Design a protein around this ligand. Structure first.
Ligand SMILES: [Mg+2]
Ligand SMILES: [Mg+2]
Ligand SMILES: [Mg+2]
Ligand SMILES: [Mg+2]
Ligand SMILES: [Mg+2]
Ligand SMILES: [Mg+2]
Ligand SMILES: [Mg+2]
Ligand SMILES: [Mg+2]
Ligand SMILES: [Mg+2]
Ligand SMILES: [Mg+2]
Ligand SMILES: [Mg+2]
Ligand SMILES: [Mg+2]
Ligand SMILES: [Mg+2]
Lengths: 75, 65
RNA sequence: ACCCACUCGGCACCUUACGAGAAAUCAAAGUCUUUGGGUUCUGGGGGGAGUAUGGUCGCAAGGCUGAAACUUAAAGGAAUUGACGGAAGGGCACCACCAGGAGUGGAGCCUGCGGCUUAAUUUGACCAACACGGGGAAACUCACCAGGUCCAGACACAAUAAGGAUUGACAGAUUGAGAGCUCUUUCUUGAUUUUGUGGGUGGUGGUGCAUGGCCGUUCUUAGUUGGUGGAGUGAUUUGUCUGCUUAAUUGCGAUAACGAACGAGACCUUAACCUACUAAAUAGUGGUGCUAGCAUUUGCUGGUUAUCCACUUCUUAGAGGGACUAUCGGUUUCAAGCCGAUGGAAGUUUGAGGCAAUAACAGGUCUGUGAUGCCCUUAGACGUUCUGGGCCGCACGCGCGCUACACUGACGGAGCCAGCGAGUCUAACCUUGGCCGAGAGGUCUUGGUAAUCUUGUGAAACUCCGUCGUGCUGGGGAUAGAGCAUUGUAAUUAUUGCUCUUCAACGAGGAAUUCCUAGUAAGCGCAAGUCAUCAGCUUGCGUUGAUUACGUCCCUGCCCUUUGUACACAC
């Protein structure tokens, strides 16, 4: 059985890669002059989300990160 | 025949060699006279018992204990 | 003229070679590496070629004498084994024929194959391919086509690597898609990986002409082999055979063979016989003993071992018996056997199978296999999944089949009989019964893991009584339209079932060709396999049940012997 060379009608697509950013401490916590700190991110209502659930942010919604829930910053 | 099932035992093996597979077939006919189960001899292997030949007497010779 | 005994010369024969020969064979072809009686002629691998030329003879035809160039690895002799023969002899087969039966080939449809078409219409196979791959494909199967993911890239090494090496992601573009596949801003996890280098693993990728295993075929036949001995320089041969006989290399026998082996037979399974044994609410019968239901000076039935006693004829299955061609009559190298009749359940090896030798085929299968060598491929994959499509595509040709062409029938009513099976609790299998529905089916329950229930599978052909009335007709039901259900996520290219409507060829089929000898052909249905659904297929089962023949070698072939061969890739 002879087989031909597959010829593609579409360009090759690349596999996505994790974004390289050196921001792991910059936008997570802030330190006051005396030393008092309060976490500025929100808390998932579902208890199986973690104390450090660290709800992310978008332009019009807030992303959970682990439980994949959606909230609003303007609540 | 049936004595193939009764007395013939066969095995088949494949042998992986650098040039291919080599088939081995082993066939063994065990002596029927051995073992205690099933037929102990081949069919039509008829054996005859020796007559235990005895001479004939002439006189009646009544015998009493 | 005959007979007998001789003898010389001659044409020759028979046996065997002591001898010779490569052998066939030879009384010379002996007296030859132990080579010498005398003498003439001829040959030196096969062709070119008895040709060319010269000479010579001939009236001519031609004869006699007679090269070379060049070409070529064999040509040739005798014998062996096989194969083949429009060779002979002897046997045999319904995958041969005769006498026939049923047909197929003609029609419509189903299915497989080729060809065309197509993105693909995956593919193997050409007596011994073509309802075969258990190949009845909606998804899967799948191997093909258009696309989308994923790594299920083990291990070793090196590099990146404190937020990194890495993943995963709601929504919005996007994609057939609620695949974060790719992205749009940015969160989760954390030395599990990424990248590269070796390497590895998969592959229904190729190679069945590299292989194993299995299967088919040669070949349904009777055939095959060594030990010792005999023959031959040897390959080989005899054993393993003239005749008779057998289904049989089965035997009687003959015999430079003897004694053995495999195959055949024997054996095993199944089918028939057993009023013999052992017994059985998972099989039955009787007593109706028990109540009893219906008709009546006794029949048919109901519930019948937790209502009850018996008892195995029928049913079941264990141990057994039974047939060994028994007896008889004939015939025979009167032996192996064969033909009739009588008994017997059974007398073609009683029927049918299972198993089944040596040697082989470039027979089929790499698409059954985590059987497999080699080659190719391996991250945009020939790996694996997911969506959709194809495998089914139709100017056509062919092979298995199904349904028919009608009155030995169709239709309607009624009668009303098998055997082989299978069946769920790791989940929905076989389904009784009641109810609903024209139907197909739906619903509520029951029993059955089964000699217990489905199931007495109350199958069909068939039978009886009626409608039809020789009109392609009320035969035929292809094609097509409408609706109702079931299986399935999914039914369109209509899965299948049901109802109404449409109602085509087909009036018995050219050449040609298949199968079969008794419970067989043929008709008829049923169960199982494949199966969620789907039989017009297969494997088995039973019901009804012929005609013809107990033969031959004419055709097609098979076996043995002899014979010829310039065949061995074997006519
Ligand atoms: Mg046998
Ligand atoms: Mg003479
Ligand atoms: Mg010469
Ligand atoms: Mg016909
Ligand atoms: Mg498909
Ligand atoms: Mg082959
Ligand atoms: Mg010898
Ligand atoms: Mg698919
Ligand atoms: Mg097909
Ligand atoms: Mg029955
Ligand atoms: Mg189907
Ligand atoms: Mg079926
Ligand atoms: Mg089939």
């Amino acid at each position: 059985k002879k087989r031909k060379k597959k010829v593609y009608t579409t360009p090759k697509k690349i596999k996505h890669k994790h974004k390289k950013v050196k921001l792991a401490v910059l936008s997570y916590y802030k330190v006051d002059a005396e030393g008092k700190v309060t976490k500025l991110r929100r808390e998932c209502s579902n208890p199986t989300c973690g104390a450090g659930v660290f709800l992310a942010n978008h332009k019009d919604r807030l992303y959970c990160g682990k439980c994949h829930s959606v909230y609003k910053v303007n609540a | 025949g049936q004595p193939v099932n009764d007395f013939i035992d066969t095995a088949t093996r494949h042998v992986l060699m650098r040039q291919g597979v080599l088939g081995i077939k082993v066939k063994i006919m065990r002596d029927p006279a051995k073992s205690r189960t099933g037929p102990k001899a081949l069919p039509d292997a008829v054996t005859i018992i020796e007559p235990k030949e005895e001479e004939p007497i002439l006189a009646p010779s009544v015998k009493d204990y």
